[PDB]
Design a binder for this molecule. Structure first.
Ligand code: GSH
Ligand code: GSH
Ligand code: GSH
Ligand code: GSH
Lengths: 221, 227
């Protein structure tokens, strides 16, 4: 198995992929991007990913494509990794099962709502050149609404003591949320206010593969 | 097959599912929600879908689940319908193939950036209680960015005259984008400024199943109101 090529940056979306690659025990190499310098909008990278954003992977083990499968969107990459590299179903469910589709539901809920909304909150709080309270308020509030939904989802998993989003194992859904959950403190939002999510977060943060994923790439150079 | 129950409203997201169901030739029954009355937040519906938004389906044909499979998120619902009801691959690619994954990448791109961003623009223009120019400008501009990307994507499918987002067939990625492309006119954004999208868009509206899905639930004087 050849190293997977990871185009990334030290961001919640990047962390999803680096964490899940560590969890699957996959070898990989990274190319690191400086977002503040608009490097993901450079021509050569947009040829790989039209959207011009990280993360993107190139898997040279995918034989049908010359030069390897190039894939973007954390939602798609996570699914691809699970389908291809977790056939033992340690972190995923068999295709076409209810638990498989519920995984999809909550993964897509994460990429379609959690990420975009918390991202807007981060923009109005940290990045925006002007202070716009309407926006700060709209996205902080909706961020809280969404984590309230995840708290509810966990509460529904009674038979496995609300330890996982779906059934009796972490799935790509958990790992996707994990990336952003890790950034909540930046908005002065204490994840412990949602008790089940607090336990779920603490559990994941104890796994060495999670701790390693959060280190890739470093916040440094 | 038994009818699939569709919880929906006349909205870009609802249309994604009603259009795809029509394309797949599946029997279904509709229950509409009045969003101005906060109906998707009622206790009974939040039990089915914790997020409290439409659309949501119930497939009584799914045999694993008592009472049928309940599924939310247009992205998951689309993937589910394609997996389950398009085994002939008329609107999807075989599981595991490069084209299958590119379909997934562009579908996720739609639900993760197109919908959320164009929805914010719609909020700042039609729904916000005050005029917030920073918001209006931010989301209109980013909406145009995203359609530009979809234009680039189409341009890379030269071998198929740039008619499809992936390969030689419409997939869930196209049908996903279509629901929201339909809403560009409200913002006075002419999709024809992206000429490949313009042809792609015009081609889809010629399909009888698309025209039908856009009438589900029906347009009327009770829902043709922008604010
Ligand atoms: N929906 C995408 C989000 C990707 C994304 O937001 N990437 C950010 C960093 S986390 C980025 O590349 N920003 C640079 C830019 O937008 O110019 C996904 O889930 O992968
Ligand atoms: N182009 C972005 C730059 C900042 C950015 O890329 N933020 C990422 C997170 S680092 C984001 O919000 N992603 C949203 C998502 O995951 O869908 C902006 O104008 O806000
Ligand atoms: N990520 C969701 C978005 C769903 C969505 O935005 N539904 C809207 C109608 S299009 C809704 O139910 N709004 C009611 C509310 O939020 O109160 C999906 O793609 O299914
Ligand atoms: N909860 C919304 C109500 C409006 C709404 O639900 N808009 C839908 C479309 S009708 C939306 O933007 N969905 C975002 C998406 O599809 O990801 C708000 O706060 O503005």
């Amino acid at each position: 198995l050849k190293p997977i090529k990871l185009y990334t940056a030290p961001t919640p979306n990047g962390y999803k992929i680096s964490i899940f690659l560590e969890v699957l025990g996959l070898d990989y190499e990274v190319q690191k991007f400086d977002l503040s310098k608009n490097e993901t909008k450079e021509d050569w990278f947009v040829k790989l990913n039209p959207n011009g954003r990280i993360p993107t992977i190139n898997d040279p083990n995918f034989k049908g494509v010359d030069g390897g499968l190039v894939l973007s969107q954390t939602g798609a990459i996570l699914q691809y990794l699970a389908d291809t590299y977790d056939k033992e179903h340690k972190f995923s469910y068999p295709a076409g099962t209810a638990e498989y589709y519920k995984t999809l539901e909550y993964l897509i809920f994460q990429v379609a709502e959690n990420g975009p909304i918390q991202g807007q909150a981060n923009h109005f709080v940290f990045a925006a050149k002007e202070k716009v309270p309407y926006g700060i308020n709209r996205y902080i509030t909706d961020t809280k609404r969404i984590y309230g939904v995840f708290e509810d989802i966990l509460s529904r998993n009674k038979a496995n003591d609300s330890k996982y989003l779906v059934g009796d194992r972490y799935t790509v859904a958990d790992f996707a949320l994990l990336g952003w959950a890790y950034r909540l403190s930046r908005l002065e939002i204490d994840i412990n206010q949602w008790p089940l999510l607090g336990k779920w977060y603490d559990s994941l943060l104890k796994l060495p593969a999670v701790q390693k994923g959060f280190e890739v790439p470093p916040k440094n150079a």
